[PDB]
């Protein structure tokens, strides 16, 4: 359900940070997560606060990430959108 | 589900809108009518993308996306809401059954019009029918929903930074309009233009040769000349083609003191026959039949609704469809997939109405009541901007082309409309070969702005004057 | 000869009028607009003449003579002049060429309408076309040439001495309107009238019985009631009533815990059905098409001119004809004779338009754009009062019926208009049996006077209310 | 040709005097007449002063008549109007 999903967002977040700042962070594993969802019939808005582990050359480091997800369950097209809104080390 | 826009009168509308505005936070900083547009869309990246793009699909994708982002948040909410208001839906859909007879000219000839070029009377019937449709259901609530009978702009105010880019567009528009007008010689046209302004005497002995000489066309050059002058410069010539005639019947039949009354008495017939025929040529002139092909968005939309078998109860699903279609750029293929796959009965029917490949001649001539995939966007601006089943979703944004008309055209904001149109045009130019296209959307939008449209719901058919004869400053 | 009323603007007009007035010495002592009427017409002798008369020809003659004497010198000179002004002539005749399309509904359907009853959309189209026609040529110069959108007056002051004669007329008018019915009881009408105002509770307990009780024909009493009310109090009732049900269904939502949600769900549907059927009944009501059959004098005049192929150059002869026709009573016979024999070809054509005996039903239903001998008088007031070829001859006097509207309707002069109309009526009453006549000129004139017309050039279609519901004091 | 034309107006003069003023005087013949006409294109106004002989039972006596004639030469109807304005013995 949820635990089966976060790790994807974590990898996404790292992969996004790799591009945003031109680096070679390798995702390790996730440790903390804090979801906050707002559903309104068709319109869904989920904000995720992530705390994850990532490698930088070899040493394992902690990272406080933050991701926005906007969804819209449509009759013809279900829309999904992700946006790493913030990514900082712990 | 159900239409959450219960409105039947302007007061109710206004109440609903005032209610909608506070809960959503509309603005009109950049738009003629209140909207969600809080920032002029920056389409810069789509250019560099179009440049970097290689395959055509990605270019089309980029363009579509650009256009969406342009139109995404700048829809005229009041008018759009009014257009899909239960009342106007009811009356608008009703009107077609109560008047099926009057529109048979093009209605029953639909399947033929998918392939064939419409005849002038069909266009006339259509336009009149549109104006009646507008009148009968009390569509007019404000200027943005009025029918323009006014005048084309002679001066079009734009920021310096893009002037040459606009003048470039017109230069390409002018070029196109001239291919519609062609090719009868220019000296003849000058003969006419200068003739009406007040030098009739030449008529006795025209310099080109004989008054009745025919060219490659099987008829007197005079007729073609008058027809040409009329094409390029309106109907008025045909009035001066009776005032300026006083010298004809007058100097020939009336003035017994100056000219003969035997071999000259028949000369009166000579030119007037050509004037008559000139009117007959002008009526069917390519310019006019192209001019008549001008489309009335809301009327054609509701017509298509009627043809699709949409009821005021199935309408919300259509609105939801158009909304979801406008929400995020998604191709014609997926559009058709979604059209066919829906449980709704209209989707397949509405799909069957498409006539994209069917048509043969230049698309500019296609009857305005013929649906095509590309023309879905005509519906999109009426119904798609606000999903009636859940209007609050409108804030998400749903872009459809003509919403660009909602943008402001004044220097205070530096004409975001013009900027947008130019941007899209240059994107299209970077992506594709403009010359090889029948119709350039941006050019059309500009041309619509040039006749002074300020909402996609205005009917600009009865506007008078040539819009491409304007000056950019 | 040629039209000697050189005017294209109000500026020229006023000067022309001031120029004409000083040399002739017009007055408006007894008339709403300046005229030659210096004494209220005395039609006394024609009564005694009518009493002493035996054969019908002499009676008709007497009536004609009386009417002429009445209308002879009391023509509205300013407006009449403007109506036949070169400018308005050109624009008015022109307009028909430039707008043949909008009027095709009745224009091209002419030959059939001569015999058959028109359909509602034809009447509507006619009226719309007229209202546009007025706008397009800038016809309005003052109130006496405006289009009335006001409401019929309920209080009409006439001298005591003729009161009984007026109420008698109305009583005979009311009787005629009741022939619209082929009679549904009055209590239902009161019920509806009080119901629509916002009292849904009534629906629960109709005094007659149940909401669905039927009459004769066995149609819903509600439907007939609303249908009736709409006639007497405008089109609006179908909204104000349909509204009054929303408050019910609303009320049925609160007490949905108390009252069923099955047999009550159908009360709203039922009532809405009755509103619909009522709309459908009102749509085809004799009252409405009769209301719509009202003729627009100047528009129909110019239409007939156009149809006769009259140009702005041949018009003076037409004005001369109508003048000579109105100057002295001359039968239909002489008119038809003179119409054909004239060298002018229009005279020949215009005659062909007549359709007098052709009609079968009550003549009141004949489309207002259909010319008949009797209706020629409609042109006479526009063009005949002042012969444009020689305007001074207007001093001779040329009477046409509707000129009676130029008379004053106010207590200062003891309402000479009303007196005249009454006198004519009493003459026709002395001569013939009113009951047996399709059209009573005096009654119609009164009916036109009652909606507050004060010039024959006003359009009183957009006036609102039932004119026969007025009170005499 | 006036002498071939005028006298008809006299016959009219008596015939009116017979009726409006209640008598039955019989026309004999005319000797004097004085026309005075005013024309204005279409509009004509002629005043006639006639002196005529009439029988009243048997004896023939003279009468000073006066007739107004208003004409309007129209294109479709030429209009004529007569009115005995005065009739007195002489």
Residue numbers in the entry:
A (entry chain E), D (entry chain F): 32 to 121
B (entry chain A), C (entry chain B): 1 to 182, 192 to 482
What did the original publication write about this model?
The RdRp and NP associate with the segments forming ribonucleoproteins (RNPs) that act as templates for all viral RNA synthesis activities. Affimer affinity reagents are a class of non-antibody binding proteins based on a phytocystatin consensus sequence that scaffolds two variable peptide regions that represent target recognition sites.
To further characterize the interaction between Affimer-NP and CCHFV NP and determine the molecular basis for the interference of Affimer-NP with CCHFV NP RNA-binding and gene expression functions, we solved the high-resolution crystal structure of the complex. Two Affimer-NP/CCHFV NP complexes were elucidated per asymmetric unit. The structure shows the variable loops of Affimer-NP bound to the globular domain of CCHFV NP, mainly interacting with the residues Q329, F330, F332, E333, K336, R339, K343, A347, T351, N399, D402 and L405. As previously published structures show, CCHFV NP contains two major domains: a globular core and an extended arm. Although no crystal structure of CCHFV NP in complex with RNA has been solved to date, analysis of its electrostatic surface potential reveals a continuous positively charged region, likely the binding site for RNA, comprising residues R45, K72, S149, H197, K222, R225, K237, Q303, K336, R339, K342, K343, K345, R372, and K462 (highlighted in blue in Fig 4A–4C). The interaction between monomers involves residues 320–354 within the head domain of one molecule and residues 210–219 and 260–272 of the arm of the adjacent molecule (highlighted in pink in Fig 4A–4C).
